[PDB]
């Protein structure tokens, strides 16, 4: 029975290494990672890998690892797949902790845009959870934390994190992570997976997939929302992606909306994440 070495980047940036049989389905590796992380609420999380295009793909837990990574290294990242709309309803604090770690990376990476004050408030709750009560002995008029908080760090932002941290005296880690999530969950791009596309007229847009539905970002003025209830069917063909959109109240026919993706693989990637999110929605 031949075994392949797996390397997994965890959300704290640490690296987990293990072996699985070469014919293993993704679930086998994911179970080993989740046991390492003492994670029980596993269904919100998944593993990603990079293809030769350095594009992120979800490892399908139901499919053979070898049939997915194909030519690539057995190198993966542990990520949030389904962002809970209401993280207070997760059963375990450790689930909320890994969700906070994922959101901290979504923020630093710029996937999750954030106002100055929200960057400072989230940062202040992270510092509270990890260091406890503000300590002046660990501070100065110049102080620059180790913590990454934003895609573009400024002294103004560092100062504001310290001001807010002083206010959290006595707050426990689970409490500070809950306040972190109460703020993060309200951000317009929370849990939104963005896909580059063109509309039917060749105009570049972004397609956003999230718990609530599919978002179109044409411009800051033109923004379509298709709540999952309105979506009957999601399909791809060649480089094309289509959604079948419910007749309006008293209308006779469904409508189909068509999009151009960068290639067949990018169309397939978007369709799979849409199907998986639509299922998640009907379980809420
Ligand atoms: C079990 C997999 N399924 C996929 C959408 C899922 C994922 C997260 C929560 C949940 O209640 C269900």
From Swiss-Prot:
**Tissues expressing the protein:** Expressed at high levels in brain, with lower levels in kidney, intestine, and testis. Detected in lung.
Question: What does the UniProt entry say about where the protein is found?
Answer: Cytoplasm, Cytoskeleton; Cell junction; Cell membrane; Cytoplasm
Name the source's superkingdom. Answer: Eukaryota
Q: Which residues form the FERM domain?
A: 4-284
Question: Subunit structure, briefly?
Answer: Interacts (via FERM domain) with CADM1. Interacts (via FERM domain) with PRMT3; the interaction is direct and inhibits the protein-arginine N-methyltransferase activity of PRMT3. Interacts with PRMT5. Interacts with PRMT6.
What exactly does this protein do? Tumor suppressor that inhibits cell proliferation and promotes apoptosis. Modulates the activity of protein arginine N-methyltransferases, including PRMT3 and PRMT5.
This chain's protein is named Band 4.1-like protein 3
* Organism, scientific name: Homo sapiens
Name of encoding gene: EPB41L3
Q: Which residues of the full protein are shown?
A: 107 to 390 of 1087
């Amino acid at each position: 029975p031949k075994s392949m070495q797996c390397k997994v980047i965890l959300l704290d940036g640490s690296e987990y290494t293990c072996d699985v049989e070469k014919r293993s389905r993704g679930q086998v590796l994911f179970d080993k990672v989740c046991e390492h992380l003492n994670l029980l609420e596993k269904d919100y999380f998944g593993l990603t890998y990079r293809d030769a295009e350095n594009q992120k793909n979800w490892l399908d837990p139901a499919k053979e690892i070898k049939k997915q990574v194909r030519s690539g290294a057995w190198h993966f990242s542990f990520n949030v797949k389904f962002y809970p709309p209401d993280p207070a309803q997760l059963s375990e604090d450790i689930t909320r902790y890994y969700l906070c770690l994922q959101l901290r990376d979504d923020i630093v990476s710029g996937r999750l845009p954030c106002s100055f004050v929200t960057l400072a408030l989230l940062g202040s709750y992270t510092v509270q959870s990890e260091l406890g009560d503000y300590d002046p002995d660990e501070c100065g008029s110049d102080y620059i934390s180790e913590f990454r908080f934003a895609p573009n760090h400024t002294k103004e932002l560092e100062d504001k994190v310290i001001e807010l941290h002083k206010s959290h005296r006595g707050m426990t880690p689970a409490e500070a992570e809950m306040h972190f999530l109460e703020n993060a969950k309200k951000l317009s791009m929370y849990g939104v997976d963005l896909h580059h596309a063109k509309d039917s007229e060749g105009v570049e847009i972004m397609l956003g997939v999230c718990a609530s539905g599919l978002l179109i970002y044409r411009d800051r003025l033109r923004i379509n929302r298709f709540a999952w209830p309105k979506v009957l069917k999601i399909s791809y063909k060649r480089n094309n992606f289509y959604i079948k959109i419910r007749p309006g109240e008293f209308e006779q026919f469904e409508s189909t909306i068509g999009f151009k993706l960068p290639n067949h693989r990018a169309a397939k990637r978007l369709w799979k994440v849409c199907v998986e999110h639509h299922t998640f929605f009907r379980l809420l």
